[PDB]
Amino acid sequence: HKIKGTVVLMPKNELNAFLGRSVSLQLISATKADAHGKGKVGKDTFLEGINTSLPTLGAGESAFNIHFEWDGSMGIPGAFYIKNYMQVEFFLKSLTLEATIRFVCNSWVYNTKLYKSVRIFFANHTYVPSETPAPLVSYREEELKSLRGNGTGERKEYDRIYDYDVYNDLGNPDKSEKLARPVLGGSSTFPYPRRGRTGRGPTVTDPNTEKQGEVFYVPRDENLGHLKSKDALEIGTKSLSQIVQPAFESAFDLKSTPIEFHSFQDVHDLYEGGIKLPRDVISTIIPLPVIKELYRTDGQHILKFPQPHVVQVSQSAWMTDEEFAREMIAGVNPCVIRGLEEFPPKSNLDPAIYGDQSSKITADSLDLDGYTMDEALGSRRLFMLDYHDIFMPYVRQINQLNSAKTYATRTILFLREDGTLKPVAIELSLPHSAGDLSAAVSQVVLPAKEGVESTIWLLAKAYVIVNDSCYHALMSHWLNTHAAMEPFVIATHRHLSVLHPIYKLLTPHYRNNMNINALARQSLINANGIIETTFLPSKYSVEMSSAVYKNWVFTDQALPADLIKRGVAIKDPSTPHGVRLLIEDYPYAADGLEIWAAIKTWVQEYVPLYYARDDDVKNDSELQHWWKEAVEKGHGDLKDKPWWPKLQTLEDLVEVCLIIIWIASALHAAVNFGQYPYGGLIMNRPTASRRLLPEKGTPEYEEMINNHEKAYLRTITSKLPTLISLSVIEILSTHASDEVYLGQRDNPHWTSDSKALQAFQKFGNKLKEIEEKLVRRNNDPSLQGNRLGPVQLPYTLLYPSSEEGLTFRGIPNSISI
Ligand SMILES: [Fe+3]
């Protein structure tokens, strides 16, 4: 009596050597236990041969036949051990036992000698702890214990140990004191989400900073391999910082290309005829995977970037006040604008430190289309993009840097009767303290279409967008998605068994997150990394995100809560989503509520399948340990806050899962995939400002009058950092062809529970339904103003589906790039 089995695997390089005694499997009983209650284990069974039957098997996968000596007396198998005797590791896809038991593995199996304990895999059945078959209970807990490790040791490539550590690996003090950075996390001064522990040990000069490493470890299965090298987008950041950036820098050091852009056409040239660079620079770029997909080239001297979506219909539309305001609700960073319910706007900052903080904007100077200020306030037509209190504490130190000058800005917006937003004033604030050496002062700038006044207003918009791009990159994007999510990924693997229903519900939403984050700590947010060298704050960039994290609230990440907290919607039970938008045609929010509702329905239908009552949640030992750790360790610097859900009810479980899935999928997609589409034209999304407004009677002032484009270009991001920044956002705005989107799973057998599978199928049908609805919105002529704007760019960032590439649409399951 033998059990026919089929093993599917993928050789490292993407067959006969797997035969003989190279690979052994041992079935484990889920019903028959030894003298210790542990499922009985069969004999070592090696692969018998290659199965070349079923056409249903692609992706460089190969199937192997195998038969197990398993009598009905050994009970029913529910798990199995596997040992790889070969030198090289292989990727185990699955095991299928006929007469059907399925095992979804998708895990790298290294040589048996590298493992402390034998790799164990479970059948695709789902069990809360109290439902674990008795013979698998100890195996279940031992595997979790193996995943947690002991909190010590330098992690190796094949390790599968999940643990936490602070952000003490960004500075490079051993190379230079100038690259020393404060540790983020673990202090009241610098609170911060934790990240995955790597354990490389301390630097030589600072026992609190982790030494450098050529490879930043992530548990093995978190490091996603790809069939196509072009899909390994995450490695592009490393290549860009380590290889391409130096190549670009040499071209400028050698004066082979003008150091600065001299006109707007010089910028447009980048995606038209291209930029000519030294042959050796082109040759350095053209052969790199991922990087070579970023530019078209003649193979000799030309690099051509792709035409950004924002200029595809009108190359000048970005300069309109209409587009400036529209992007606050349908642009790359559509989630910062707030309702303004009083006037003038107020500040909570200390005047003793920054000087009188009262606003200089006068109500009578504003054009509110005939409305009085009281009418605008009462009708909820006044809004603002407020970076005054956020930036003021950092303005002095930023402006002390050689090539950086910024203002803490505030923009007032009026919601017109036609439903579009219009900018009516920009306040450019600077701190003032007795003894300041600078004579520059704060000022208010009003809209202007002609003369030098129009140039000053255009520059004021640039200062505002430099604040916005910095806040978007560091807070809306990095902190709120990438960084805030990692602690939950770690806790999930450490406390929820692969058999756990919540593990199955949440893990698809973590795909590639730890991997891109580790590569980010190494090349994106590190000392002298991409962000520090391309954005305004320089060496103060990441710590600014720590200051902002002091105010991060998990429950305020829920879309309705966010909209209400920002004063852009009010609670209204008579509405489908329970909230009424104050800007009715707010694309991000309107489309977002649809996706939010679909995820909610899915979570509300899934949870009840495994938890009947609130008591079943309080009594799930794994679930309680998971949440307790996620909060007290993962986001431990905020463990003293009262807003954390308790997770003692079905309601709380649904809430926590819904928010986690929202952040990982739709929120990240909405703030991530519009980076190159909107920011690919540096004038539309400047990452830095290098000078304050000029004083009358100076050559700089005369320049605003005689050469406004040059005045603008000298103020924003320089040409070299612009080339580096455009390259990184082009990578980050690209969808890998092997992405798994919302409504999809990487395997149709993730669970054997038909009820869960049916619920998931309904969720995907609902997303398709939603996409048709969003298409109708974009085609509705009455919504053209905010959904398309003068740039005529349909808001498709929350469309659920997408083909590969730089598409400006599609919601992946996770923070995958
Ligand atoms: Fe991202």
Side-chain angles (χ1 to χ4, degrees), residues 477-478 481-482 516 668 671-673 675 732 815-817:
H477 189 194
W478 175 261
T481 65
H482 289 266
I516 181 68
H668 176 259
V671 301
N672 182 80
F673 297 96
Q675 292 183 93
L732 306 183
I815 293 158
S816 66
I817 189 51

Side-chain angles (χ1 to χ4, degrees), residues 746-816:
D746 68 28
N747 194 296
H749 305 302
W750 50 284
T751 184
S752 54
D753 298 338
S754 59
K755 51 185 178 175
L757 293 171
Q758 294 306 73
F760 183 66
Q761 178 68 190
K762 288 185 288 193
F763 172 48
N765 292 347
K766 183 62 180 180
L767 291 167
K768 293 173 182 296
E769 180 189 308
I770 289 169
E771 193 168 305
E772 296 181 304
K773 183 178 185 183
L774 306 187
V775 168
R776 290 195 291 280
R777 286 178 182 174
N778 280 330
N779 289 316
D780 184 342
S782 291
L783 309 182
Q784 188 286 329
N786 295 347
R787 294 193 70 91
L788 272 70
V791 296
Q792 303 293 175
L793 177 49
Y795 189 70
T796 55
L797 284 165
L798 285 169
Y799 272 27
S801 74
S802 182
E803 288 305 308
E804 78 303 316
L806 204 168
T807 67
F808 195 58
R809 55 179 283 170
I811 305 176
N813 272 324
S814 61
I815 293 158
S816 66

Side-chain angles (χ1 to χ4, degrees), residues 477-553:
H477 189 194
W478 175 261
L479 181 69
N480 291 355
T481 65
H482 289 266
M485 183 60 51
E486 188 160 354
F488 301 113
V489 179
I490 295 170
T492 302
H493 286 282
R494 287 175 57 86
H495 287 288
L496 301 190
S497 159
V498 293
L499 289 160
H500 205 288
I502 304 304
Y503 178 101
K504 299 187 177 190
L505 177 71
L506 302 182
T507 57
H509 300 294
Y510 305 152
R511 179 181 166 105
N512 215 34
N513 192 171
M514 289 186 75
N515 197 29
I516 181 68
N517 280 14
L519 289 161
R521 295 203 305 280
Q522 174 178 56
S523 304
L524 189 70
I525 59 171
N526 58 303
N528 213 46
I530 299 300
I531 287 178
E532 287 194 4
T533 64
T534 60
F535 282 82
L536 175 85
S538 191
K539 58 180 183 181
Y540 299 115
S541 298
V542 195
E543 63 165 276
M544 280 189 67
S545 67
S546 172
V548 168
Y549 176 70
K550 297 181 177 169
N551 300 137
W552 180 89
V553 179

Side-chain angles (χ1 to χ4, degrees), residues 702-729:
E702 294 311 306
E703 182 181 65
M704 289 194 303
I705 297 171
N706 303 314
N707 200 339
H708 77 279
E709 291 189 0
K710 181 57 170 168
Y712 191 87
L713 295 163
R714 288 178 180 279
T715 299
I716 67 167
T717 312
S718 196
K719 176 181 175 182
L720 171 57
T722 290
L723 297 169
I724 298 163
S725 191
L726 295 175
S727 302
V728 80
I729 60 177

Side-chain angles (χ1 to χ4, degrees), residues 3 52 71 123 174 186 197 203 270 287 290 299 313 365 384 405 476 607 645 703 723 735 761 811:
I3 295 178
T52 180
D71 181 70
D174 281 6
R197 184 173 182 282
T203 59
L270 298 177
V290 178
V313 176
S365 74
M384 76 178 325
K405 293 298 172 293
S476 304
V607 174
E703 182 181 65
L723 297 169
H735 283 305
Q761 178 68 190
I811 305 176

